């Protein structure tokens, strides 16, 4: 459930992060067997990005993407995907263009616990091009359950997980009403923030917001969050105590004093400690077959002989939920700190990850990958 009201900021350049690009299949590739081709673009700012999936260099038509969301550092990520049947001679690729790149990048396809509810909000001003783009997504744990997109046709809060379709019309109209009121607050903040930083009225700027609550194994309140960023940088955040604010610069201190005087933090606290956990608990219960599950990792190892004197061992974990996982390489039983790819979505609710270690050639059997995950009945140890 969304928060019932949302206070505007007071009156007090944009960052550039280049996208990481991962091109891969949902399941292990087998020629003749249908699959999903994924292009995962992450770590980027600002949000405007172009992404195509290519078959023999030509743009594939039936291509969907995930709803825009972002990481703890405010950088965005999106999954583009298509159903496909691989063959030996068909070539697949992902083409990304972004303002941080001097040319289009083409990446070939080479082959017990706590719970949370989180909402993520992005508003992007588009001067001369109507009102700001507003995208809202709601999650329970690592599972998206709702979305709103101001450029989609319906102008409704929309379901994105079967279990939320249990809610009646009052729920859907109510969340639509409140999400539109969220978009209003953000649209106002954009104009106010431009003026606050003496910025050109012709440029595009970004407001991001994240709020929500954690519950423990007992399903009672643990922690609450409310965080706000302008142009991919911290502006103001509610402290752990839910009683005070951390302002990033002098312009945000003005919002701090306004929000202190209007008792905003205390209105936030009632939602975060009350409404937020009540509805979290209710969602956990209504979707328990979906949400109260673990999917164990399916693990294997690959060996890439790079030189005459070294080799790289890649340890894989596939099709696991939730996303939290630990892969570590050991050298003769002692741990060894390698590269670690961003945990990427498979596209079906599950996740993928690998950890690689560069080892001297002829000492393969010396190393072992260890895989710790909530859904394994016991830990796994892989060897070569």
Curated annotation (Swiss-Prot):
Tissue: Ubiquitous.
Changes after translation: (Microbial infection) Polyubiquitinated in a post ER compartment by interaction with human herpesvirus 8 MIR1 protein. This targets the protein for rapid degradation via the ubiquitin system.
Subcellular location: Cell membrane; Endoplasmic reticulum membrane
Effect of residue 262 to V: In allele A*01:01 and allele A*36:01
Single GO MF annotation: peptide antigen binding
Any Gene Ontology CC annotation: MHC class I peptide loading complex
Effect in UniProt of substituting residue 365 to K: In allele A*80:01
Predominant location category: membrane
Induction section of the entry: Up-regulated by IFNG, and pro-inflammatory cytokines IL1B and TNF.
The keyword S-adenosyl-L-methionine appears for this protein: no
Region (Alpha-1): 114-202
GO biological process: antibacterial humoral response; antigen processing and presentation of endogenous peptide antigen via MHC class I; antigen processing and presentation of endogenous peptide antigen via MHC class I via ER pathway, TAP-dependent; antigen processing and presentation of endogenous peptide antigen via MHC class I via ER pathway, TAP-independent; antigen processing and presentation of endogenous peptide antigen via MHC class Ib; antigen processing and presentation of exogenous peptide antigen via MHC class I; CD8-positive, alpha-beta T cell activation; defense response to Gram-positive bacterium
Effect upon mutating residue 278 to D: In allele A*01:01, allele A*23:01, allele A*24:02 and allele A*80:01
Effect of residue 268 to Q: In allele A*11:01 and allele A*24:02
Phenotype upon changing residue 175 to N: In alleles A*25:01, allele A*26:01, allele A*33:01, allele A*34:01, allele A*66:01, allele A*68:01 and allele A*69:01; requires 2 nucleotide substitutions
Domain Ig-like C1-type per the UniProt entry, residue ranges: 297-381
Consequence the record notes for mutating residue 175 to Q: In allele A*29:02 and allele A*43:01
Residue intervals annotated with topology Extracellular: 114-384
Phenotype upon changing residue 356 to S: In allele A*25:01, allele A*26:01, allele A*29:02, allele A*31:01, allele A*32:01, allele A*33:01, allele A*34:01, allele A*43:01, allele A*66:01 and allele A*74:01
Disease per UniProt entry: Alleles A*02:01 and A*24:02 are associated with increased susceptibility to diabetes mellitus, insulin-dependent (IDDM). In a glucose-dependent way, allele A*02:01 may aberrantly present the signal peptide of preproinsulin (ALWGPDPAAA) on the surface of pancreatic beta cells to autoreactive CD8-positive T cells, potentially driving T-cell mediated cytotoxicity in pancreatic islets. Allele A*24:02 may present the signal peptide of preproinsulin (LWMRLLPLL) and contribute to acute pancreatic beta-cell destruction and early onset of IDDM.
Full protein name: HLA class I histocompatibility antigen, A alpha chain
